[PDB]
A paper describes a structure:
First, it stabilises the formation of the replication complex, an asymmetric FluPol dimer comprising a replicase, which is part of a parental RNP and synthesises the genome copy and an encapsidase, a newly synthesised apo-FluPol, which binds the 5’ end of the nascent RNA replicate to nucleate formation of a progeny RNP.
To characterise structurally the FluA asymmetric replication complex, without interference from the competing symmetric dimer, we therefore used in the following analysis the monomeric FluPolA/[name]-4M mutant, bearing the PA/E349K, PA/R490I, [name]/K577G and [name]/G74R mutations. The FluA replication complex comprises the asymmetric replicase-encapsidase dimer with bound hANP32A. The interface between the replicase and the encapsidase buries a solvent accessible surface of around 3300 Å2, with three main zones of contact. The particular juxtaposition of the [name]-627(R) domain with the [name]/627-NLS(E) double domain is a key feature that distinguishes both the FluA and FluB replication complexes from the previously described FluC replication complex.
Numbering used by the authors:
A (entry chain F): 41 to 137, 227 to 744
B (entry chain D): 1 to 63, 73 to 716
C (entry chain E): 1 to 184, 207 to 227, 240 to 633, 656 to 669
């Protein structure tokens, strides 16, 4: 309490700072504006003079510079924190309830949020960038109108680190679920092994045939499955869990899995159980399974069962049964409570130390692509799909750009604004023609969907109505075109407008919580236009360049600033003194005034005699 | 010296050492050698318990950690871990806190490092601690190592590594030229016999501090030392009175009754400013010369009105000075005109001392100071009137006050700065919740009240602490942003503070506040008892039959505020945080049962109905928006009406709510003393209107839920 | 149609919306509960609950004393301060039996800290009574004055710097017949009785603050009590938030799941309001002597000095009273030193009755209060007693079909009782009530309720079907601490982070706290973002910086740059958070060691860190 008020009041005076006397003979006696940067008074009880924080800012902005040495080496503690945070990743958050400085994120009131910090380890820049880009593209395309064509458009309309991603895809042998799905959609060759349950399944012995079986679940729900009959030998490959599995006709006989931690081993074991197509787990199904992705589209029953088991499997472990175990070198058991045991283990699931690892394969196959990106090989088994794509997201060692129409809402609201205006400026000719001819379709363009999110819901229909009326006036008046205004104001009209009487002098866009304001007339921090250089700046980030179209009024009048009114340029003292925007509601048709639009400039305006209508 | 330890030792070990010494309350700056000693001890313990694991068969494998650290944690965690280990393995409970625990050997090991010879340290440690089945690991910087029974759990490689670490550390101290101090600081902690004798006064006091039937402390010590329980509790309970018992009253649905409300004259407004009846003289967009200064803004806002009349009193202050309020209002207007006549107007203008100003403030009505010796012989000299205020009946105007406080305004009252981007999904959920709530409540009247109070209180405090002996004038300004997006500046009235020579935080400054309004105070005069009402103009308002003229009233009232109350009113922004916390807690409570982030369907769904009111046809629901606005309004009302009565009633009624809840879930509840709880709750319903309305809400909820 | 927030509970279970019922969530502005009449009523009630206790006259302070221990057993449900020594000792013995060695380990692990603490440890703490000046004073200045006076009086052993040495110095000074106080030159001679009464004072602006001669002994006894509690499971101290949340769930799981389906379980939540009336320092001394059985005598004396001294505690009486005459419009104030002999016509009926009750105790303007305790000095010992009472509820001790357990933290208590039938539950609750009454533990029947197991609360940790709703903390100040730009930023961001970690602060609420933080910081230091249109003198040069920098995000918030903090990134220092983004020239200028401005919290030694004039 006391310190805050004391500092607030102390900073008020002109010279609240105390500094050594040397500053007298090192910095100018005042500023370029003649402001004094010090005072001759000496601190009580010492020889230090009194100066002002303006001197602090002067030193910060144009003070003498020195070499930055001993700083990176001395601060060895917080730098590692920065590296771990930035190079770390994240994951799905579950509402149920290295790791010594992230406590708030990992644990909360009643939810858990996974996080794996970084450091300087792991794979290279190109592979990680490709994996993350493919993950984002696939995840967004999951919810598109048609994932296949949309995904192709995103892949062909994006690049990685200044290099088109198609070249990397064709010249990079990196393997990943998202990358493999993108390659399959592109029609190239993908790995024979099929990514299921988050791990790569590679067959290396045995075979089976597909049969359609109807099975009654433990919850009294009948599901149709494509059960495989015949001995098969699979290897589950994963970074933190590698396993070797045998399967037979509706029977699991052996599974040896090695993982760094118990969680990965448990995940691999659950994946093996679900892949085994055992009747016992069918009888162990509880509840109604309707798992869907962000697109709410129903998935195949196997994926739903896998998700249900991943949610929890405590009620299933004890149902398998009890069998004996033999003590062997490099052999570990699996208790029902998920704990290794020397004397006992869970049925048909063992744990080894080294496991099956090391050598990989370089085999590729020709595959076909179905409606919703579900990659299926010639045999019939599902190879890949977005349902099996991991949720991990990290950082990009090199800049990655996404010019598509649905990747904009990734870099942030500022990025959304900048990219919407970039799209508007890049398509200036076509957008102008559409606005002139059939603007109704333009106002329904999906490319403006992100902007509708930034504009508050409570004040988006009224904003849209104001914009529609203003643009109708601009169209029906003629002779007063102004491209900058059109680009600035177009995106706000997307909503289904409604009639209103407000005369908006500024519209609000929510960026990073704080709401910025863009003025209908003149320049705004959100939208700046420099006519001296003819450049548009959006929040300090360039958005493109504007070229004046074959319509313009270079002699005053501007009809798209005040609804129902036409501004006639410079003010005239002869007419009625400066009015108020609210008062303008009483002027008669054709009346003129000297309204004060804003800032410190007066503009003469005449009330439109006609009336511009909208749908 | 500590710089070397900080730079060499890894951050985690130094952080653990800092926490450990903070637990014992020892400052590292004063004690330097012990800092290095503790850091080395922790380092050697961790190395002893590093890169060691136990395989699933039982054999020792080097890559379930073989060694578990017990001294690397705090006392509570270490004690819990050792208790659990002993209970599970049935091992003899250690006397002290061991440094490490070996799982393969299932035994507790202690680590010791000394500057002097190892043998003396081992001997003293064994004599002090070792009594049965205990092992100590002893090392030193001299390169000589030994342990108990010549048994080392660590292999040759680990022992050599620890020896090399100690040797390189010793070489570092030798190079730095401070190893001599390190060695000399060690002395073995000579444990000379400690004597603490109670004698003289303390012996008498101790002898006079024993239970009955005891003559001296020594007799009691001997008695307790030889004490062994034998059925004393059972005997006392058998001989205890049967009437003593905590009986459970069967709590059914019919038992509860509504709280008995007090009877008497209706309540009255006591807020620092009007809430439902405030009036604003506003400028849509301040672009005039000299912006930012509250005085110029107030002058400009005043110039927008031309309906001034000759002031006259409609509803007078019954127990107060009516004419002087009028005189001081006239003085305010004349002083403003005089300021208008000036050219070089300073930042603020102090009103000249006048009779009416002093009388309205209360300076001339303030009792003087004199010692009790010179005023004892006074016929009516009594203790301050610490008498319980008279009961006041519930009045409907507070209900309307809250109703209008919960309505939706048409301006952006609160402006908040920016933060970083959100990358984690939990960050996305948090941003979504915050943005939804903010969009909901940013247009509520509660935010208007918050900003008005903050501005008034900050200006008043700055004026009070700026000029001590000046009766300054302070406009009541509030800056907002309309829906259209124009910076509106509203002026509600004026305040004049008294003398502000403040030395204590609780010192009371007296001010006189004049507030505009358009409510006729002859409709509910009882609501207005502390105010003097003047009619200082007429306003033209547009209605379906043109511009009708209605009177413009002014409420003048003398109030007092303390610096701590000023800060409390300057920190009302926390009402938004509290209201969020409430809605977020409800979100989490409803989500946990369903086990999924439910904010998306909580806010956007617009299919939920939370009972938030009542109507003639029955109860009424609303939206999550209505819920958020109601909670924020309740928080602001609680902040403005801060009184012990409110907290008392809330605390005593929360228990009744909980018991009713338990009744709803068929938990078969019971009450030991229901009437006592009822009396405790009703003790807080005497005169306050806010608490009375809360009690009325509680009675409505009681009569509705049990149906 | 008319707002009614309470009606929310008509569909939402109350436990979910409990925050609705916390009106303040802060420090109110009135400070109701401190004065003189409150002390009068406290003393009167303390001596009333010991009505039948034996009366005696003290020999050193020359004041009466009341001893209710072993008095007649209560016959009515009203509060009783008749705590039996034998029952307390039996309860402690049973606690030791169920937890063997606990007292032994506590003693042997605390002897070192008893022999290790330095004198400066007493500097940390709350306000202290300065016998030299006879008024509440900061601990540090009180210590300085005490050492100065003792040095003047030839008691300089405390110069060794050991806390035990200073305690011995205090013992010697108290043994002296009289001492001198030199204030600045005014000399005051305090006799043996005067000094003794001063040293046993309890000032009242932890409502009560003892003097300085009793700080170290209180600290030692509280350290032992904390050490004993640590080994105790039912004890609610000194754990934090997560462990406290887990305690309720663990207790419920233990009591319910293990129980048979036939058995019925119930839970009672109770508040031990006015918890210090019925607990006497003599019973605490008895339990302390029992704890240190077969231990070195010096340690026993050091540990037993505290309750011995407190049993003769003297309570000060507020600042006084204020009288006013409306007829003559006059105001006057009278001190408490003149309250012993003064007319009772000035006061009202209740106040004059209280004065009549407390008249025969005021010694030298300071009442004598042997029985009862004062808030917030021996809380851990009270928790120890409560956990002993709880431990006396096992199936082996009860020797009955029913049984019980629960938690106690000395301010709230919860008890789960289960039995084969409803009559069994009634018998269990009644037996617990009587047993806790015998020891002097008082359960308020007007603020306690019983319901089927699953839903209850403890220390505001409301529990419903495995869900805890911790509401035991208030929101701190998110403002400028007033040191410097980097210092304030670092301390405040660390504050919000720490509150998030433990105090159970929601993420969105943390985000708004950071928002208000940025607002207040920019307003106070006048360092606004370059893009913003706000105007001030500092905005001029600041503006220049905004133009010069090639990376806006690199600039520090104090320098006008954007605030990139968020939930994910809060622990990192602000300077380190923008290290790479900062332009090379800006980095060199900012952290120049040769700057003229420079001759806990985690921050970098930038030029923004200066000492205010």
């Amino acid at each position: 309490k006391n310190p805050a008020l004391r500092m607030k009041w102390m900073m008020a005076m002109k010279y609240p700072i105390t500094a050594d006397k040397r500053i007298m003979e090192m910095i100018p006696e005042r500023n370029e504006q003649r402001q004094t940067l010090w005072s001759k008074t000496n601190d009580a009880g010492s020889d230090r003079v009194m100066v002002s924080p303006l001197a602090v800012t002067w030193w910060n902005r144009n003070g003498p510079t020195t070499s930055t040495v001993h700083y990176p080496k001395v601060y060895k503690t917080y730098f590692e924190k920065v590296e771990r945070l930035k190079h770390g990743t994240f994951g799905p958050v579950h509402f149920r309830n290295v790791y010594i400085e992230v406590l708030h994120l990992t644990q909360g009131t009643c939810w858990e949020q996974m996080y794996t910090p970084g450091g300087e380890v792991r794979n290279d820049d190109v592979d990680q960038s490709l994996i993350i880009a493919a993950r984002n593209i696939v995840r967004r395309a999951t919810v598109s109108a048609d994932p296949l064509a949309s995904l192709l458009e995103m892949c062909h309309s994006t690049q990685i680190g200044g290099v088109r991603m198609v070249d990397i895809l064709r010249q990079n042998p990196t393997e990943e679920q998202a990358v493999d799905i993108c390659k399959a959609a592109m029609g190239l060759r993908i790995s024979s092994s099929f990514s299921f349950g988050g791990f790569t399944f590679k067959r290396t012995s045995g075979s089976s045939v597909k049969r359609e079986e109807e099975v009654l679940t433990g919850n009294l729900q009948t599901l149709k499955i494509r059960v495989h009959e015949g001995y098969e030998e699979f290897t589950m490959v994963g970074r933190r869990a590698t396993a070797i599995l045998r399967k037979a006709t509706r029977r699991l006989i052996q599974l040896i899995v090695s993982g760094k931690d118990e969680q990965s081993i448990a995940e691999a074991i659950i994946v093996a159980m679900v892949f085994s197509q055992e009747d016992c787990m069918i009888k162990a199904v509880r509840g109604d399974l309707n798992f869907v992705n962000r697109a709410n589209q129903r998935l195949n029953p196997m994926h739903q069962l896998l998700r249900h088991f991943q949610k929890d499997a405590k009620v299933l472990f004890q149902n398998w049964g009890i069998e004996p175990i033999d003590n062997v070198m490099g052999m570990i058991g699996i208790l029902p409570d998920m704990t290794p045991s020397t004397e006992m283990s869970l049925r048909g699931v063992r744990v080894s130390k080294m496991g099956v690892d090391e050598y990989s394969s370089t085999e590729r196959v020709v595959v076909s692509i179905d409606r919703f990106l579900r990659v299926r090989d010639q045999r019939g088994n599902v190879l890949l799909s977005p349902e099996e794509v991991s949720e991990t997201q990290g950082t990009e060692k090199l800049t990655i750009t996404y010019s598509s129409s649905m990747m904009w809402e990734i870099n942030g609201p500022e990025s959304v604004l900048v990219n919407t205006y970039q799209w508007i400026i890049r398509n200036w000719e076509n957008v102008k023609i559409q606005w002139s001819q059939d603007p109704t379709m333009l106002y329904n363009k999906m490319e403006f969907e992100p902007f509708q999110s930034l504009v508050p819901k409570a004040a988006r229909g009224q904003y849209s109505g104001f914009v529609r009326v203003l643009f109708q006036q601009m169209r029906d008046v003629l002779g007063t075109f102004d491209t900058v205004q059109i680009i600035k104001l177009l995106p706000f009209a997307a909503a289904p407008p409604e009639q209103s009487r407000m005369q908006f002098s500024s519209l609000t866009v929510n960026v990073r919580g704080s709401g910025m304001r863009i003025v209908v007339r003149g320049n705004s921090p959100v939208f700046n236009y420099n006519k001296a250089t003819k450049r548009l700046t959006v929040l300090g980030k360039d958005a493109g360049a504007l070229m004046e179209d074959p319509d313009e009024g270079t002699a005053g009048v501007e009809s798209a600033v005040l609804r129902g009114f036409l501004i006639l340029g410079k003010e005239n003292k002869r007419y009625g003194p400066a009015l108020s925007i609210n008062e303008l509601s009483n002027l008669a048709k054709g009346e003129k005034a000297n309204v004060l639009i804003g800032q410190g400039d007066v503009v003469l305006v005449m009330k439109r005699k006609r009336d511009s209508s909208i749908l | 010296m500590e710089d070397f330890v900080r730079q060499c030792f890894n951050p985690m070990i130094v952080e653990l050492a800092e926490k450990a010494m903070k637990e014992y309350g020892e400052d590292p700056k004063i004690e330097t050698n012990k800092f290095a000693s503790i850091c080395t001890h922790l380092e050697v313990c961790f190395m002893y318990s590093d890169f060691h694991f136990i395989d699933e068969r039982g054999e020792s494998t080097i890559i379930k950690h073989r060694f578990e650290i017990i001294e690397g944690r705090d006392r509570t965690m270490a004690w819990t871990v050792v208790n659990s280990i002993c209970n599970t393995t049935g091992v003899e409970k250690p006397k002290f806190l061991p440094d490490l625990y070996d799982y393969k050997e299932n035994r507790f090991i202690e680590i010791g490092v000394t500057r002097r010879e190892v043998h003396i340290y081992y001997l003293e440690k064994a004599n002090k601690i070792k009594s049965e089945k205990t092992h100590i690991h002893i090392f030193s910087f001299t390169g000589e190592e030994m342990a108990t029974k010549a048994d080392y759990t660590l292999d040759e490689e680990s022992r050599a590594r620890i020896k090399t670490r100690l040797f390189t550390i010793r070489q570092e101290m030798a190079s730095r030229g401070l190893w001599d101090s390190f060695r000399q600081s060690e002395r073995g902690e000579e444990t000379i016999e400690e004597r603490f004798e109670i004698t003289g006064t303390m012996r008498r006091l101790a002898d006079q501090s024993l239970p009955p039937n005891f003559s001296s402390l020594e007799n009691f010590r001997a008695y307790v030392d030889g004490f062994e329980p034998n059925g004393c509790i059972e005997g006392k309970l058998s001989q205890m009175s049967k009437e003593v018992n905590a009986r459970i009253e069967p709590f059914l649905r019919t038992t509860p009754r509504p709280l008995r409300l007090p009877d008497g004259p209706p309540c009255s407004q006591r807020s620092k400013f009007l809430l439902m009846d405030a009036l604003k003289l506003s400028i849509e967009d301040p672009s005039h010369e000299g912006e930012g200064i509250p005085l110029y803004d107030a002058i400009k806002c005043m110039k927008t009105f031309f309906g001034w009349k000759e002031p006259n009193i409609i509803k007078p202050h019954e127990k107060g000075i009516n004419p002087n309020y009028l005189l001081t209002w006239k003085q305010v207007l004349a002083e403003l005109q005089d300021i208008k006549n000036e050219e070089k107007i300073p930042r603020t203008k102090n009103m000249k001392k006048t009779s009416q100003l002093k009388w309205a403030l209360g300076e001339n009505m303030a009792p003087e100071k004199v010692d009790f010796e010179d005023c004892k012989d006074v016929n009516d000299l009594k203790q301050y009137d610490s008498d319980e205020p008279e009961p006041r009946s519930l009045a409907c105007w507070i209900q309307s006050e809250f109703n209008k406080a919960c309505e939706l305004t048409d301006s952006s009252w609160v402006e908040l700065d920016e933060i970083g981007e959100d990358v984690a999904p939990i960050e996305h959920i948090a941003s979504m919740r915050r943005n939804y709530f903010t969009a909901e409540v940013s247009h509520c009247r509660a935010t208007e009240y918050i900003m008005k109070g903050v501005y008034i209180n900050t200006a008043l405090l700055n004026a009070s602490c700026a000029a001590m002996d000046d009766f300054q004038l302070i406009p009541m300004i509030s800056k907002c942003i309309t829906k259209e997006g124009r910076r509106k500046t509203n002026l509600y009235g004026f305040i004049i503070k008294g003398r502000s020579h403040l030395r204590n935080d609780t010192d009371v400054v007296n001010f006189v506040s004049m507030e505009f309004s358009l409510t006729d105070p002859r409709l509910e005069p009882h609501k207005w008892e502390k105010y003097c009402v003047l009619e200082i103009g007429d306003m033209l308002l547009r209605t379906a039959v043109g511009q009708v003229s209605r009177p413009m009233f002014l409420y003048v009232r003398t109030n007092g505020t303390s610096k701590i109350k000023m800060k409390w009113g300057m920190e009302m922004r926390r009402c938004l945080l509290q209201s969020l916390q409430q809605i977020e807690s409800m979100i989490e409570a409803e989500s946990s049962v369903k086990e999924k982030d439910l904010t998306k369907e909580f806010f956007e769904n617009k299919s939920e109905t939370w009972p938030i009111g009542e109507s003639p046809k029955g109860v009424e629901e609303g939206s999550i928006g209505k819920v958020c606005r109601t909670l924020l309004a309740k928080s602001v009302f609680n902040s403005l009406y801060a009184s012990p009565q409110l907290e008392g009633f809330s605390a005593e009624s929360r228990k009744l709510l909980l018991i009713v809840q338990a009744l709803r879930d068929n938990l078969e509840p019971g009450t030991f003393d229901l009437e006592g709880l009822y009396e405790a709750i009703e003790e807080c319903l005497i005169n306050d209107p806010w608490v009375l309305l809360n009690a009325s809400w509680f009675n409505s909820f009681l009569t509705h839920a049990l149906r | 149609m008319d707002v009614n927030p309470t009606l929310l509970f008509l569909k939402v279970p109350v436990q979910n919306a409990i925050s609705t019922t916390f009106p303040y969530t802060g420090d109110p502005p009135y400070s109701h509960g401190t004065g003189t009449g409150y002390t009068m009523d406290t003393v009167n009630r303390t001596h009333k609950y010991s009505e039948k206790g034996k009366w005696t006259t003290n020999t050193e302070t020359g004041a009466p004393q009341l001893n209710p221990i072993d008095g007649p057993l209560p016959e009515d449900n009203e509060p009783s301060g008749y705590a039996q020594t034998d029952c307390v000792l039996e309860a402690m013995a049973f606690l030791e039996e169920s937890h063997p060695g606990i007292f032994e380990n506590s003693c042997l692990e605390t002897m070192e800290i008893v022999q290790q603490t330095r004198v400066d440890k007493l500097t940390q703490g709350r306000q202290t009574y300065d016998w030299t000046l006879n008024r509440n004073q900061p601990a540090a200045t009180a210590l300085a004055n005490t050492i100065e006076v003792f040095r003047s009086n030839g008691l300089t052993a405390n110069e060794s710097g050991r806390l035990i040495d200073f305690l011995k110095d205090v013992m010697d000074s108290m043994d002296k017949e009289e001492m001198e106080i030199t204030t600045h030159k005014k000399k005051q001679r305090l006799n043996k009785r005067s000094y003794l009464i001063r040293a046993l004072t309890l000032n009242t602006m932890a409502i009560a603050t003892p003097g300085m001669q009793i700080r170290g002994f209180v600290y030692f006894v509280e350290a032992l009590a904390r050490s004993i509690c640590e080994k105790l499971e039912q004890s609610g101290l000194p754990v934090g938030g997560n462990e406290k949340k887990a305690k309720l769930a663990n207790v419920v799981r233990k009591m319910m799941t293990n129980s048979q389906d036939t058995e019925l379980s119930f839970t009672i939540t109770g508040d031990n309001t006015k918890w210090n009336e019925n607990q006497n320092p003599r019973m605490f001394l008895a339990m302390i002597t029992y704890i240190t059985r077969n231990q070195p005598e010096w340690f026993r004396n050091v540990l037993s000095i505290a309750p011995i001294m407190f049993s003769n505690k003297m309570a000060r009486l507020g600042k006084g009273y204020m009288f006013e005459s409306k007829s003559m419009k006059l105001r006057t104030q009278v001190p408490a030193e003149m309250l012993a002999n003064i007319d009772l016509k000035y006061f009202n009926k209740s106040t004059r009755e209280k004065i009549e009750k407390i008249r025969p105790l005021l010694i030298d303007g300071t009442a004598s209060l042997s029985p009862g305790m004062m808030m917030g000095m021996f809380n851990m010992l009270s928790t120890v007693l409560g956990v002993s009472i709880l431990n006396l509820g096992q199936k082996k001790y009860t020797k009955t079909t029913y049984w019980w357990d629960g938690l106690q933290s000395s301010d709230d208590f919860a008890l789960i009782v289960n039995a084969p039938n409803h009559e069994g539950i009634q018998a269990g609750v009644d037996r617990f009530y009587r047993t806790c009454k015998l020891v002097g533990i008082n359960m308020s029947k007007k603020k306690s309720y019983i319901n089927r197991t699953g839903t209850f609360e403890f220390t505001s940790f409301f529990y419903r079907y495995g869900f805890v709703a911790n509401f035991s903390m208030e929101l701190p100040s998110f403002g400028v601490s007033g040191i410097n730009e980097s210092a304030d930023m670092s301390v405040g961001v660390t504050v919000i982070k720490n509150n998030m970690i433990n105090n159970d602060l929601g993420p969105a609420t943390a985000q708004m706290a950071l928002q208000l933080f940025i607002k207040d910081y920019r307003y106070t230091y006048r360092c606004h973002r370059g893009d913003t249109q706000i105007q001030t003198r500092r905005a001029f040069e600041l503006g220049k910086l905004w133009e010069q920098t090639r990376s806006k995000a690199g600039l520090l918030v104090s320098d006008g740059g954007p605030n990139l903090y968020n939930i994910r990134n809060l622990h990192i220092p602000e300077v380190c958070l923008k290290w790479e983004l900062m332009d090379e020239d800006y980095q060199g200028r900012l952290c120049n060691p040769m700057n003229p401005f420079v001759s806990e919290y985690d921050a970098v030694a930038t030029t923004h860190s200066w000492i205010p004039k």
